[PDB]
Amino acid sequence: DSRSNAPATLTCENMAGVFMLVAGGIVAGIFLIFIEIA
Amino acid sequence: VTIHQEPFVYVKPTMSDGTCKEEFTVNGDPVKKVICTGPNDTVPQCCYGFCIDLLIKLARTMQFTYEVHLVADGKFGTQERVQNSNKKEWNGMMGELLSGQADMIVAPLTINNERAQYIEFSKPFKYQGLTILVKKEIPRSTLDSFMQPFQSTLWLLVGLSVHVVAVMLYLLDRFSLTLSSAMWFSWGVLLNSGIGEGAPRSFSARILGMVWAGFAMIIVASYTANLAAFLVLDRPEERITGINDPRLRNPSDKFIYATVKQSSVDIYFRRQVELSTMYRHMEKHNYESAAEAIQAVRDNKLHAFIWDSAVLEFEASQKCDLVTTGELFFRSGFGIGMRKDSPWKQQVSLSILKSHENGFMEDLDKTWVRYQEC
Amino acid sequence: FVIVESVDPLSGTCMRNTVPCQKRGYIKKCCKGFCIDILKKISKSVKFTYDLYLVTNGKHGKKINGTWNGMIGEVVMKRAYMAVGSLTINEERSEVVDFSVPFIETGISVMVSRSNSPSAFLEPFSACVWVMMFVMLLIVSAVAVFVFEYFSPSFTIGKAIWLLWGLVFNNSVPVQNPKGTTSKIMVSVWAFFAVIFLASYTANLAAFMIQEEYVDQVSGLSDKKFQRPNDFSPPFRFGTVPNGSTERNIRNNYAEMHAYMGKFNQRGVDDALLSLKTGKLDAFIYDAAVLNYMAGRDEGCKLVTIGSGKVFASTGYGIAIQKDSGWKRQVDLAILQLFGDGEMEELEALWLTGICHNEKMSSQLDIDNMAGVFYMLGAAMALSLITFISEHLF
Amino acid sequence: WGLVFNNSVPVQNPKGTTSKIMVSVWAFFAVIFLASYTANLAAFMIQEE
Amino acid sequence: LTINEERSEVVDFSVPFIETGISVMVSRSNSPSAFLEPFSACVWVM
Amino acid sequence: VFASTGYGIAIQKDSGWKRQVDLAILQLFGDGEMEELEALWLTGICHNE
C-alpha cells in the first residue's frame, strides 16, 4: 500500500453508520406514520 | 563608548540645541537618554539606547559618572598582525580598552574565546547566538479569482455543454417555452437556484435531469476542492535551515551569502575547518555595515547574509520584508568586557546578578524586545 | 563525484582540503571533489602517496580503434597505479582493468522535469455510497407509497422520484412539493441525510485535493514510450552525450532507441542538463548516481529523475587499477574499512546531501479528469437517448 | 437576499426573463460566494494558532 | 549551576556551559475565530 | 525567557583554575561539539511548534 499518507480514505462504513441512521429515519417514519396518521 | 545598533542603541544626531526631543514610552515614560560623541559619519552626539540604559542602571547601582565616547571604528577588536611588528592587534573598542582610551566596557558583543585570551569579559547580560540574515520573499499566492479557479476552456465548455444536453432532452420534449423554460432548467441547474417553472414530465428526460444534477454536484465540488487547493499547501521552498545548509555548503556564484567585515560573528567564522570555502568567498564579498546589512536585505542584493542573530531578531521587528533564520549558532550573548580588573569588575558582577534577579531586563524587553508587532 | 578550480590567484595554490593537479607543459589547476577526498582519506589510512593529473583524452575508455579513449587507456598506459573518477563497472572495463566494490552505488537513469490526476470525480465516492443511493430509492418510494395511503395533482412516485431524487443532488428542483406533514418529515430524513451526504462530497473533494500521488513516468529501458519513438505524436527525447558508458550499456540493452536516440543526442552533462532546464528535449538518460547528482543541484524546483529512483542497470563508482597490481587486495581492504568509517554520511555532507528534499503541488483547474466527469455525463445522456427511443417503443 | 445564504427560500419566484438573468448574476455570484465560504472554512480549518 | 546572588555571594563561577531560566510546563491543550475569521469584512461590504 | 540563567561548574572564590577553567569554557563553546551535546542530550524527539 501507499499508506505512508492517508489519501485513500473513502467513507463507506463510517458513513454507512449515519446512512443507517437515515434508514431508521424511514422506520420511525413508519411507526409515527401509522400512529399519528391515525 | 559603543556603536549605534538598533538592538544595542538608537541614537540619531541631537537637536539643533544639542538636545533630545522628549519621547515617552509605549508605557508613557520619557526614558532617560544622554549626550554622546559622534563621528562625521570629532563631533558631539546623543546617547540613546536600551542597553545604554542598562549601563545607566549599572552606574545607578554603584556610582560612576558615565562619559560616553563614540566608537572610532565599528567593531571592538581582534588581535591581528600588522604589515610588520609581528604583533596581533585588536583595533577598535576592545583595542581602545587595551589602549585604555576609555574606562567602561560598553558593547553587546558576544563572549569571544578568541578575545578571551586578550582579556576577560563579564557574564551574559543576555543570551544570544548566531544565524544568517533571513529575508522574506513575496508572500503573493492570491490567484484565480472565481473564474480562473476553473478551466475557462472546460468551464464554459461544460456550460454550453449543459446547453447542448438541454437541447437534447429538449428534443425529448419535442418528440414523444418548454425550450426556453428549459433554458431556465439547465442553466438554473447550473445555478441549482430553483428558477421554479417546473421539471419535465418525461421520465427519460427526467433521468437526464438526475444526470445534469450529478454534473452540478460535481461542479460545486469543482469549485470546492478548487479553492481548497488554492487555499491549500504553501510556498514550495523557503530553504536555509541547517548550519551546514547545502546552498551554503555548495560553493558557487549563484548563492550570495556573507557577513560583516571584521566581526566577532566573523570570528565565529574565523578559525574552523568547514568554513573554508565559505569564509573565503564571503570575505571577498563581505560588507562592513550592519546598516548595509539591513538595507542590504531591503536591497535584496545578496542571496543571503549573516550577522548577530538575536540582533537580527530585534531587526526582525524592523521590517516585514525579511525572515527569521532557523536556530542558534556559536551562541553567546551580551555583556561588558574586563580589561585587567577594576572595582567595576566584581561590582559589575553583582550588577548582572541583581539584573537577572530584578526585572529591569524585562523592562528592556519593553524598552526593546516587547515591541514586536511582527 | 569530482570538483576542480583555478588555483588561488594571489598564492597560485589551493588551501583547506583542496588538492593540486597540473593541466597542459602541464600547468596546475585545483584538484577538488568529495569522492576525490574519499581517495584522500583512503590513501591516508592506506599510506600511499597520491599524485593528480588532468585527463587529456575522453573520459573513461573505449575501443572504437580497439583501444581506450580515456583513463582506462592510462591504465593501459600504466601511467598510474590506480586513478580516480566515477568508475563504470563494465564488462569491457571488467576485461580491461581491476576494480573492487564501489565507493558508491550507481545505475542507469533518466530525468524528466517535474510535471508542468484522473481520479477525483469518482475517487472518494466509496461506491457503496451509490448502493446507499439505490437503497435511498427503495425506502424513498416506500414512504412515498405507504405515506400516501392515509393521504389517499397527485405527483406519483415517479414525480416523488424526481423529488427525493431531487434532494439526491443538492435538491434544486422547485417543482411539485408534496404537502404531507408526515411525508414532510420523511423529506426531513432524506433532507439532513442529503446534508451529511453533500458534506461527504465536500470533504471528499478536500481529500482528493489533499491527495497527491503524481508519478506517471516512463518504465525504463523497457519503457513503451521508449519502445516506439513514433508511437505518440511527439517523440520523447531521452538519452545522454556520445561515447557514454551506460550508453554502451543501452547499446547492449536496446538498440532501436540507441539509433533513434542518436537524433536527439546532445553535448555535455551539465550543458544538456541546462537543455532540460529549457526542456528542449523530453528528458535525459544518465548514470543514476550521476543523475541524483544532477538532482541535488537545481535552480528552482524543476527536474524529476525518471521514476522515484528505481534501480536501472545497477552499478557503482570507484578507483580501478590494472589487473594483478600491488595494492589490489590492500586497496580493497582500504575500501572495506572506508565504508567501515561511516564518514560516507560525511560524503553526503561534502557532496551527496541534497536540498531537493524528497517525495512531494500546483493548481489543477484544467479539465482532464473533469473532462472525464463530463464524459460520464454525456455518456449517460446518450444512454437516456437510446433508452428513450426504446421508451417510444414502450 | 434569499440567494444571499444558499438560496433555500422557495416562495415568490419573479418570472421576469431578463430579471431571471439578473437572478443568474446574483446566482453564480452566490456560487462563487458559497465557495469562498467553503474554502474559507478549509483555511480556518487548516489554520492552527 | 544556578547563577544566584546567594551563589554569587557564595562561590565563583564563569559563564555557563548552557543557558537556563525560569519556566513552567502545561500539558498540551486537551478556536474563537473561524466564524467571522476568513470572511474578509469587505465581503459584507460587497 | 523567564528569569534567564545558565548552568555550569562553579568553584570557590579565588581559586587556581579560575581564569583557566574560564578559558576552558571559552574554547569549549569554541569546539561546536555542544551540537553534540544536543546529540548526547539536548536533541529532542518532541519536534517543535
Swiss-Prot record, chain A:
Transmembrane parts of this sequence: 15-35
Reported tissue expression: Detected throughout the brain, in brain cortex, cerebellum, thalamus and olfactory bulb.
Entry's localization field: Cell membrane; Postsynaptic cell membrane; Synaptic cell membrane; Postsynaptic density membrane
Modifications the protein undergoes after translation, according to the UniProt entry: NMDA is probably regulated by C-terminal phosphorylation of an isoform of NR1 by PKC. Its phosphorylated state is influenced by the formation of the NMDAR-PPP2CB complex and the NMDAR channel activity.
Family: Belongs to the glutamate-gated ion channel (TC 1.A.10.1) family. NR1/GRIN1 subfamily.
Protein task: Component of N-methyl-D-aspartate (NMDA) receptors (NMDARs) that function as heterotetrameric, ligand-gated cation channels with high calcium permeability and voltage-dependent block by Mg(2+). NMDARs participate in synaptic plasticity for learning and memory formation by contributing to the long-term potentiation (LTP). Channel activation requires binding of the neurotransmitter L-glutamate to the GluN2 subunit, glycine or D-serine binding to the GluN1 subunit, plus membrane depolarization to eliminate channel inhibition by Mg(2+).
Domain notes: A hydrophobic region that gives rise to the prediction of a transmembrane span does not cross the membrane, but is part of a discontinuously helical region that dips into the membrane and is probably part of the pore and of the selectivity filter.
Protein name per its UniProtKB record: Glutamate receptor ionotropic, NMDA 1
Residues of the full protein shown: 799 to 836 of 938
Swiss-Prot record, chain B:
Subunit structure: Heterotetramer; the NMDAR subunits are modular and harbor tiered domains that function in concert to regulate opening and closing of the cation-selective ion channel pore. Forms heterotetrameric channels composed of two GluN1/zeta subunits (GRIN1), and two identical GluN2/epsilon subunits (GRIN2A, GRIN2B, GRIN2C or GRIN2D) or GluN3 subunits (GRIN3A or GRIN3B) (in vitro). Can also form heterotetrameric channels that contain at least two GluN1 subunits and at least two different GluN2 subunits (or a combination of one GluN2 and one GluN3 subunits) (in vitro).
Protein name (Swiss-Prot/TrEMBL): Glutamate receptor ionotropic, NMDA 1
Segments in the Cytoplasmic topological domain: 201-206
S-S pairs: 20-46, 36-47, 320-374
Extracellular compartment spans: 224-374
Membrane spanning stretches: 152-172, 207-223
Location in the cell: Cell membrane; Postsynaptic cell membrane; Synaptic cell membrane; Postsynaptic density membrane
The gene coding this protein: Grin1
Stretches buried in the membrane, not crossing it: 179-200
Residues the record lists as binding glycine: 108, 110, 115, 264, 308
Curated annotation (Swiss-Prot), chain D:
Residues annotated as transmembrane: 22-37
Site features described as Functional determinant of NMDA receptors, chain residue numbers: 6
Record localization: Cell membrane; Postsynaptic cell membrane; Late endosome; Lysosome
Intramembrane ranges, chain numbering: 1-14
Modifications after synthesis and translation: Phosphorylated on tyrosine residues.
Side of membrane Cytoplasmic, spans: 15-21
Tissue localization of expression: Expressed in the hippocampus including the dentate gyrus (at protein level). Detected in adult olfactory bulb, brain cortex, hippocampus, striatum, thalamus, superior colliculus, with much lower levels in inferior colliculus, midbrain and cerebellum.
Positions of region (Pore-forming): 1-14
Domain notes per entry: The extracellular N-terminal domain (ATD/NTD) endows NMDARs with a unique capacity for allosteric modulation, harboring several binding sites for small molecule ligands that act as subunit-specific allosteric modulators of ion channel activity. A hydrophobic region that gives rise to the prediction of a transmembrane span does not cross the membrane, but is part of a discontinuously helical region that dips into the membrane and is probably part of the pore and of the selectivity filter.
Protein role: Component of N-methyl-D-aspartate (NMDA) receptors (NMDARs) that function as heterotetrameric, ligand-gated cation channels with high calcium permeability and voltage-dependent block by Mg(2+). Participates in synaptic plasticity for learning and memory formation by contributing to the long-term depression (LTD) of hippocampus membrane currents. Channel activation requires binding of the neurotransmitter L-glutamate to the GluN2 subunit, glycine or D-serine binding to the GluN1 subunit, plus membrane depolarization to eliminate channel inhibition by Mg(2+).
Protein family membership: Belongs to the glutamate-gated ion channel (TC 1.A.10.1) family. NR2B/GRIN2B subfamily.
Name the UniProt record assigns to this protein: Glutamate receptor ionotropic, NMDA 2B
First and last residues shown, out of full length: 610 to 658 of 1482
